[PDB]
Every structure is written in structure tokens, then in C-alpha cells.
Amino acid sequence: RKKISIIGAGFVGSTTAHWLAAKELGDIVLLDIVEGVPQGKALDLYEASPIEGFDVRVTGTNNYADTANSDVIVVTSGAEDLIKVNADITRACISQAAPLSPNAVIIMVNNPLDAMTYLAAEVSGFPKERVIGQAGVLDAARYRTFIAMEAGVSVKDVQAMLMGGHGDEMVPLPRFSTISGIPVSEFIAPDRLAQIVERTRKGGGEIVNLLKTGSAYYAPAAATAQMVEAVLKDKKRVMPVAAYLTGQYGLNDIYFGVPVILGAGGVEKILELPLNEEEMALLNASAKAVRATLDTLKSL
Amino acid sequence: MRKKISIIGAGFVGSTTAHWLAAKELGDIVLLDIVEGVPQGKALDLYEASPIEGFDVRVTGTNNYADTANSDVIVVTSGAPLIKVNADITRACISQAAPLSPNAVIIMVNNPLDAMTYLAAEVSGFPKERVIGQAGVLDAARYRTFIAMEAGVSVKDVQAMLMGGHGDEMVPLPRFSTISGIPVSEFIAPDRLAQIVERTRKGGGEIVNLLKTGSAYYAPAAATAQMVEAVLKDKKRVMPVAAYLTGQYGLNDIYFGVPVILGAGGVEKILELPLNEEEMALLNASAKAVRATLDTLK
Amino acid sequence: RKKISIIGAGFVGSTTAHWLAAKELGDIVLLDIVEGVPQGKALDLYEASPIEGFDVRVTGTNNYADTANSDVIVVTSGAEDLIKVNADITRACISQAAPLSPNAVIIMVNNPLDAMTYLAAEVSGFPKERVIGQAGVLDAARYRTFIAMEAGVSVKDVQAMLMGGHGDEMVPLPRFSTISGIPVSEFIAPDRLAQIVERTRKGGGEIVNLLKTGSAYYAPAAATAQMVEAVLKDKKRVMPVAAYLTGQYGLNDIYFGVPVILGAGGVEKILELPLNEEEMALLNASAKAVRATLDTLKSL
Amino acid sequence: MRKKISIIGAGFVGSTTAHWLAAKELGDIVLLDIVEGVPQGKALDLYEASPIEGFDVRVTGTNNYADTANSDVIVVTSGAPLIKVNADITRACISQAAPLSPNAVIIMVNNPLDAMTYLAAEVSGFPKERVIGQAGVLDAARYRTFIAMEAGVSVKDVQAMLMGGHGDEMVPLPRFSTISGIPVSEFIAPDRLAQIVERTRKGGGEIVNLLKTGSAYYAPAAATAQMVEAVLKDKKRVMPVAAYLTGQYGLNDIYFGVPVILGAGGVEKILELPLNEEEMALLNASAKAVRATLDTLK
Numbered sequence A, C: 001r002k003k004i005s006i007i008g009a010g011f012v013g014s015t016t017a018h019w020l021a022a023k024e025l026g027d028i029v030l031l032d033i034v035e036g037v038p039q040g041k042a043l044d045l046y047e048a049s050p051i052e053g054f055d056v057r058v059t060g061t062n063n064y065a066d067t068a069n070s071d072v073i074v075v076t077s078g079a080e081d082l083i084k085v086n087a088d089i090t091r092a093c094i095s096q097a098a099p100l101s102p103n104a105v106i107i108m109v110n111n112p113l114d115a116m117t118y119l120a121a122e123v124s125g126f127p128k129e130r131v132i133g134q135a136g137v138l139d140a141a142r143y144r145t146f147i148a149m150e151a152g153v154s155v156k157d158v159q160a161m162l163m164g165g166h167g168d169e170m171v172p173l174p175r176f177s178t179i180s181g182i183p184v185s186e187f188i189a190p191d192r193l194a195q196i197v198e199r200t201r202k203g204g205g206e207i208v209n210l211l212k213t214g215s216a217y218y219a220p221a222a223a224t225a226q227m228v229e230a231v232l233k234d235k236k237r238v239m240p241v242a243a244y245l246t247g248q249y250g251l252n253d254i255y256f257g258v259p260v261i262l263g264a265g266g267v268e269k270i271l272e273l274p275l276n277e278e279e280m281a282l283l284n285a286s287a288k289a290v291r292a293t294l295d296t297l298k299s300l
Numbered sequence B, D: 001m002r003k004k005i006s007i008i009g010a011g012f013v014g015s016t017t018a019h020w021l022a023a024k025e026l027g028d029i030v031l032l033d034i035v036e037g038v039p040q041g042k043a044l045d046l047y048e049a050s051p052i053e054g055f056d057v058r059v060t061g062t063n064n065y066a067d068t069a070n071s072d073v074i075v076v077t078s079g080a081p082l083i084k085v086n087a088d089i090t091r092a093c094i095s096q097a098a099p100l101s102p103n104a105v106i107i108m109v110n111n112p113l114d115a116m117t118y119l120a121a122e123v124s125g126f127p128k129e130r131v132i133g134q135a136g137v138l139d140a141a142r143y144r145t146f147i148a149m150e151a152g153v154s155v156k157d158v159q160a161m162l163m164g165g166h167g168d169e170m171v172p173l174p175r176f177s178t179i180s181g182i183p184v185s186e187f188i189a190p191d192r193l194a195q196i197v198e199r200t201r202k203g204g205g206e207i208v209n210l211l212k213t214g215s216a217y218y219a220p221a222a223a224t225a226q227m228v229e230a231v232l233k234d235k236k237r238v239m240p241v242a243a244y245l246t247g248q249y250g251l252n253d254i255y256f257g258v259p260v261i262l263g264a265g266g267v268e269k270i271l272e273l274p275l276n277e278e279e280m281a282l283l284n285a286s287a288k289a290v291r292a293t294l295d296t297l298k
Ligand SMILES: NC(=O)c1ccc[n+]([C@@H]2O[C@H](COP(=O)([O-])OP(=O)(O)OC[C@H]3O[C@@H](n4cnc5c(N)ncnc54)[C@H](O)[C@@H]3O)[C@@H](O)[C@H]2O)c1
Pocket: A007, A008, A009, A010, A011, A012, A013, A031, A032, A033, A034, A037, A076, A077, A078, A079, A086, A089, A092, A093, A108, A109, A110, A111, A113, A134, A135, A136, A138, A214, A215, A216, A217, A220
């Protein structure tokens, strides 16, 4: 069977195992540095299988050797201090897991997302197409959710593309969002759409402020699981993913959220959308912020 | 209790619709037909597949309209794969089924689609929003399939809207189709897209020419079942369906394929697209043809 | 649409919302006394809907008025002191939610399960068939999981019935467990089967010891969600549920885990299995322990 | 890449099997038939239903065996709904398909089932564990359906094992059927159970008598698709299937319906039930009949 290793069995990691288990895509290995945590969550989820009817081997471990020969490696072990702390963790996870699964596609979740994905590429030495980051699917999901709510339509009929990174680094593109092929601008007035775009930018913080302790995990995990499925089933999904750029949108040597075709080979194509002056202004300012974070990381 | 769906006409499309619905576990299914044994056999066969698929659906076959009473949704797939023959079949089906399920949403499938839906509305006397026809979901599905195949992307990421009726009456709208929010024109060039539009127009005939002895049913049934689901779960799906127009697109007193929000109340909203002059030219010509068929019906 | 209210948006409650949301059974209301917690988890899960493709209205609240007219009420707000603390919480939740949803089926999860279900029946005044407790489905799930693992077969082909309550109160019945209709005893030797039965009894504690902080939730939530689905779809599931007895197995005026047919009417039938001398010895000792807990509760 | 499933014979059972499998999103599906247009039409029709159902499955139709190369699973549903006609059809199908997919697990559906599976084993020369036949899953499904209907419980909670072949060759085993681990005898009395056993024996004929012009396909296809899934996902399902026996139940050199653990390796284990003398009497008589058909084949 296919093999998926999730490094970091916290809220996002365990929830990702939950979403994946129900899909019955393959074996799942939950790894963490804390003893008992992954073993307990994995066994708990495994014991729910007879009820849900899925046949999935879900195991927990503290030994990287158990992640060997994985088809996909999901990294959810993350916690300038933020960059340093996460850089050290990401470094540790990738330097230990990558060598054991040379043919795997690595999907980063740790924040700062774009920067941590860049670091994972460096440490793993994997072809850039096989090291990607999850950020855009979650952000587009919030946007799509708000649009469906406001427009009064099924979430299954709303599509949307966006780029960049989190919050201020986010590059919203309402022009590239539709409901059953019809522009979203036809359903929602400019003023309200602007509010929705703003709510999207602050989407992660909105959850953090409500939970008081901890950040979002159901949607982030769902986003991550969808990307894992895309690779495993070679589905050719068109989605915004953190990818390594070599000229697209005028950006070079940097991980940035862009539209891609995701399949068995990881990033199989980076789409280059013809953005107008206003949208490019947004992307340039975003790339500036992402670049700044990337530089801070390189100076560590 | 559970929701109740009655499928009138247990042929290829009707039986296949029962198959798609059963797997969805949306509620009881009653397959009715004028031919004895046929609906009973297909219904029992499908029911016997339930322990394998793990779904709890009571699917039964019958020749008695009394068994369709109090249905939440009535699907009509009894037509013969022309206006006269189907007009009589449709009137007979609706006249017997409608009175027994006064709160049901009727989904017409019989061809000529737009015209038969109009007839069902007349005979049933049901509020217009609760009498609709399936046509556009199937045609948009063929279009989306071709786009997905050509672009090399998941069908889950392709969406499209179109209007009108079948074949020459279809009103393609490539401008209103996207892949994850991105215009299809970004993936497929003009000439190739035009070929896909043409293949979509001839989509039904393409399957007919291949099967030789009948018409399509897997996709037509899937489309029909998706509309049934939209109603039963009040999903508010945005899809092209045959609806009664009262001024939209400049059309009155006519059933025509238009974008709608489909839910428990049936057509809960008819969307008004900002069609350009080229697209409007196609729509007007289509309406003229649909109008012609309607006149012949009256 | 159907309406499900989950009282107590903690690990079990939020996870139950997750399992239910994917089933697309109806609207879900997550309620908690803590501000922000339910609103955050509900919104997080709602934002995952466009990714998973399900249309489910998931909302969080601190106002019981938002649970009015629910089809099913799930209680997962629980924390002699244990009985008292949980008795007070259960009392508060039921006395406030029951009056607002007079036609709902109440499914208790709070521990001590059997006793808390009994209390919910008293406080709600609902017909006993409409007040049940989840315990047996989870326990049978662990048992079935261990059997599938050992026998080397799909979890979809293992069935098992058991009675009583948790741990020492559990009444295992290997004789009433099969794989595609074949007795489990045909696949697993007596010594090993005994170990599996023992592992089942300690199943909850095994997870607690691994997690160190907190108890199981994936399987408990799955068990709860399966019971909710049984009521909403009037599925007539045959499962062990905490029900009110009036003579079955020689027990009267007590909630105890027994085999039932679960549907729209809640408990539609309490099956009376012909247990042998050995099994009855187990059930009597269990009923003694459950009774003791029930008495402690009545003396509060 | 994806898994590849080839279905030889695009008739009712074959096309319906493609339908069940497509919804499962297990891998590519190739529908092959000797009749031109038929497989192509059904495959394209089903493919066009994918954007509606939201599944990514490449389903294609063909008349060329070359398109079935390197399949993980080969389903054979080409037989005519007797030994001679199907023996020739089966030999032709296996002789052409087997060499192109040397690592595939062959699942026979053609009747006479046990005999045709034996023939497929001979012609393919494949390890016996990788050549099996579908028969028991369907019969057990009918039985489980009747039990569920009679007991008033979910089909998800009913499980049962049976052996042998079709109709008079079937070896019912009510003793080995339960509802959530509880013996069926606890819910249904002896006489009623006997009636259900008889209805199960005649289950196939019951559908035939109703349809009038053909045999069952929804449940037969579901059963076949479930076996395909078991192999592709190495699910280790415990089910009755036609397997090659080397001493089990005292039977040698014969294909017979027996309980097995079905996975990626095909039959990964043949279970040996502790049958009493009554049940063994039924099995011996059944084996005698299956043996008779086998002799006629040789
Ligand atoms: N990209 C997105 O869209 C997105 C969305 C949400 C959260 N995130 C990020 O994902 C990360 C995880 O969030 P969370 O809420 O699940 O956190 P968490 O604290 O619940 O879980 C992280 C887990 O990682 C484990 N861990 C730490 N160091 C490790 C190491 N070296 N190896 C293996 N395991 C290790 C911890 O012990 C812990 O169980 C954070 O960086 C967070 O900011 C990203």
C-alpha cells in the first residue's frame, strides 16, 4: 500500500491523519519526538476504523526509521525567534526523514510556510518539484467558504485561486474566483467582496483569537490531506501551492504561493496567470515580504 | 421516516438513476413502469447489492402509481428515446403521479426536454419553481469532461455554465467556464475550445452512434441524481436546468435552460448572466427553436 | 435539514462534529460554556467544507437557545467526586437543552456513562427509549480492531456484541463475535482471545496512559457519530447501547449496556440474548458495580 | 501512475461493474468487447458522468486486447447468459488477455462459474491463487438482504458465509450468519430461515423471471467490484469465492466456492470451517455436481 508519514503529531498532524484515514489512501505513520503522543492518537484513530469502515494501518512512533520508503512526507512539527525555532525543528525533521524516503514528495505545513518549505528543499536536496508547501489551499478554502455563505450556494460550486503567503503576504485574486464558472463579482458587491478578502487575510488569526490557546487545524489538515491525495492518486489538481520559482511572475530563487498542477510528480506545472497592474502591485509587495523572511532565514 | 423518491420509467436512464441515488443513501426509491416485472426486477437486483455496498436504501419496483404517493421528488424518465408520442406518455405519467405527491418537486428527463417540462407544469398545476427539467447538467458535464481531458487536470476542478436545450438548441458559454477559478481560455486555445463546444453539442448523438441501439444513460442518470440530491438536501447547487421564465433573458412563458440555484424549494433563484451580443444571438436563436417546439406541442 | 446539537465542544465533542460533518447528515451546533472555543472549532471545521466537498452548516455558541428543535442532542461536556462533578454538569446541560428540543433523542457520552445517562433520563423526563448512552459501540470497536489486527482480516468483516459498562463493568461476549459470520474463536486461540478481551477492558486506560494528558476521542467520537446517524437515517442498527432496563437480563430500573435496534425512535427494541452461566456470572457482577455507582448518584 | 482494471465483456454485468468501480476511484478502467462501438460508448458515457460525481477515473472502451496490457486485475464478464459456448468464449478471452498482464489477478464471472474459472486457470497458467471466480459474494449478498429485510435491521450489520456454486450447487450455511455477532437464528425462526435459504438458491432465477429478457447485473457487478477492490487495496476481505482446492473439505483438483481471505495476492488463505454432518452432506452433493460439470468440460 501507499505510505504516508506525518512528522509532528500535534493538532494539525493528528487531524491530517484523521482526514486521510477516511480516504483509505494508504498506511499512515504518525511521528513525534514526544513519547506516547503519536502512539496514542494513532491507536485511537485505528480503533475507530471498524466503525467508519475503512481499512487503514495507522501507527505512531518516535523512530524516524519507521517512516522509511514513504510516498509522501507531511511536516507538521512546527511551533525572528519564530523563524529560528521552526528552522531548527524543520532542519531536524527533514535531515532525518528525507534520506529514508528518497522518492517521496515532501509537503510542508510548518510556519513560516514559504520559508520553511525553502529550507526543506535545501536540507533534503530533493528535486524542487517534489518539495512543496501547503498554505494556498487553506486560504482559498476560507475565501470559498465565505463566498458560499454570502452568495447562498453550495461550497462545491465555488472555486478560487490566490497566491503568495499568509496574511499580509497573501495575494487575493477575486477576478480568479467563480461559482459554477460565473465570476464571483456577479454575486457579491465590491464593498462586501473587499470585506471577504480582508476576512480571508485575517482568517488564521480569527481562529486563533477564538480558540485563545492554539491555532486552526480542521481546515489546515483538510488542505494538507487534499494535497496528499493529489500526489498519491496522480489527480492533477489545479491548486495554489508554495513552489520554487525560477522566473514565474518575475520571481527567482524563492518559494511562493502559485497556481500549479499537482500530481504524482509533485509540481508538474507552474501556471503563469496574466495579472493586471493592480494585482501585480499586490504580488510584488508580497514577494518583498516573503523575500525578507527568506533572507532572515539565510542569515541564521 | 426517510425521504421518498419515485422514478417513473424504469428503462436505462431511470434504472441507472436509481443506482446513483441508492449509493447516495438519500432515501427510499420507488421504480415504476408500465411494463410488468421490469421495475420489480431491477429494483430487487439493486436492493440485493446493498449489503455489498453497505448502504441502507429501500428500493422497490411497481406498476401501481399508488406506491408513489407522498414522494418528495418525482423523476420522469418514461419517454421513448417524437413530440406526440412523448406528449401522451408525459401527460399520462404526470396526471397520475402529481395528485398523489402534491408537495413533490418534479424533475423531467423525457425529450423533447424543455417542451415536456412545460407540459408537466401544465398537467401538474404545481408552482413553476417545483417543476424543472434535466438537460444542462448533462451537457455541462460532457463539456467539463472534454475540458478536463484536454487540459490534463482533475474533473473536480472544472466548472462551467451553459444554457438553452439539446444540440442545436444548446447555448454554449466557454467564457463562463473555469478551472479552479481560472478561465478555460488560459488552458485551451480558441480553435480547440470551439471543437470541444461542437463535440458537446453533438455529445448525445456521439453516444447513440456508438451504442447503435439506444442512447446514453450513465451521465444522464448522474445528472438527474445530482439534481435530486440538490433538492433533498437543500444544497443550493448552481446549475443549468430547464426552468419557467418570466422575463429573464427577455423570455416569457417558456421553459428554457438557465443558471439557477437549486434547492428544497426547487428553483430558488434564476441567475441573470451579463451575456454579450454574440452569446445573446445564440440564445435568441435557441429560444426561437424551443418556442417552435412549444408551439407544435400546443 | 436535520439538526444536531453537541453540548461540550472539547476533544470528543469537536471530533464528533468532524465525523458527522463528513457524513453530511444535517446542521451541527457546537455548544460550550467557554466563550470562543466552540465558535472557533465550528468555524475551522466549516472552512474545511469546500475542500472536503460537504455542505454542512457548523456553528458554535454559548447560548442554549441555539440548540432548540434539535433532532439529536449529543452530550460531551463531562470532566464519588467524579460522579458529583459530572452529575452537576450533566444536570445543567440536560435541564437547559431538553426543554428546547422535546422531540430529540439524547445520546450521552459523559462518564460515568451508565449513571449519567440515567440522570439525563430523570432530568429530561423524556421517554426512556429516547435517552441512551454511548459506550458499547466504542468498546466493541476496540475489540473488533484487535481481532481484525490479529486475524489478519478487514475491519469491515468483524462484528461483536458486548454489554455492561466501562472496564471492570464491561461484559465481554466472545461467543457473540464473528468474522463474515464465522465465530472469532475459529481464528484466535483461547489464550490470545483472553488477552484481547483484557486489552478491550483496559482500552480506554491504554489511550490515557499514552496521551499522558487527556483521554481518547477519535474512536469515542466515531462511535457517537454512528449512533447519531442511526437515529437520523432510521437505519435500524444493531448495537450495544446504554439503555433503561425493566426486566431484561433480570435487571430493573437501571441503565446498562445491552444489544438494541437503534432507529428514529431511539431504542426500538432491547434484544435479550440467551447467556450461559459463565456469561451471566459476568453480567451479574457488572450490574452490581453499575448499581453501586447508580446508588452513589442517587445519594447526592 | 494508477492501478489498471480490464473488464472483458461490456454487457450488463461488465458495464455495471465499471460503474461501481468508477465511483470507487480505484484506478483506470478498460472496457473491452468483441462488438464494435458498444464498449467505447458505455465507457465514454460513464467517463462523462465523472465531473458530476466528482471522481477521477480514466474509463475507456476498446475492441483491441492490446489496450488491456499490464492490468492489475482482469474481470471476465463475456459469457452468454451452455458449457460449450462459454468454454470457447472464455478460452478466447483468457488466451488473449493473460499473456499481456502476467501479474494480474483474474476474476471470472462467466457461467458455469466454477467450471469457467477452472478453465481460465488452465489457459492462463497463472498461479492458482491468482485465478478466482465471483459467485458466493453475490449469493451471500442476496441471503444477507433477505435476512436484513426480514429482521428489520441494517444490511450493514448482517454477515454470512456460504459455499459451493449456484442454485442446487449452492451450500447454504445459516449457522454461519450473524447480525452484529448474534446468530441469525436469534432473530428468525427455523421455517422462515429455510424459506430465505430457498429464496437465495433461486435468487438468480427470480430476477430472470422478472426481467424476462436477461439476468441480474446490479448485485452481480457489485459483488465483482467488491472483489476487485479487495485485491487492489489488499483489504483481506473474508468472503466466499471460487478457489482451487488442494485437499480442503476433502476436495482436490477442482474450483469450488469456499471462504477465503482475499487480498493483493488473490486467495491468501482458504478457511476451513468445522462443518457438521448435515452441512458436509450438502457440500459433498454439491461437489459431485460441480465435478460433473468439470468432467463435461474436460
Ligand atoms: N501552512 C498553513 O496553512 C498552516 C495552518 C495552521 C498551522 N500551521 C503551522 O503548522 C505547525 C503545527 O501546528 P499545530 O497546531 O499542529 O501544532 P502542535 O504544537 O499541536 O503540534 C506540533 C507537534 O510537533 C511535535 N514536534 C516538535 N518538534 C518535533 C521534531 N523535531 N520532530 C517531530 N515532531 C516534533 C510536537 O511535539 C507537537 O506534538 C505550526 O508551525 C503552525 O503554525 C500552518
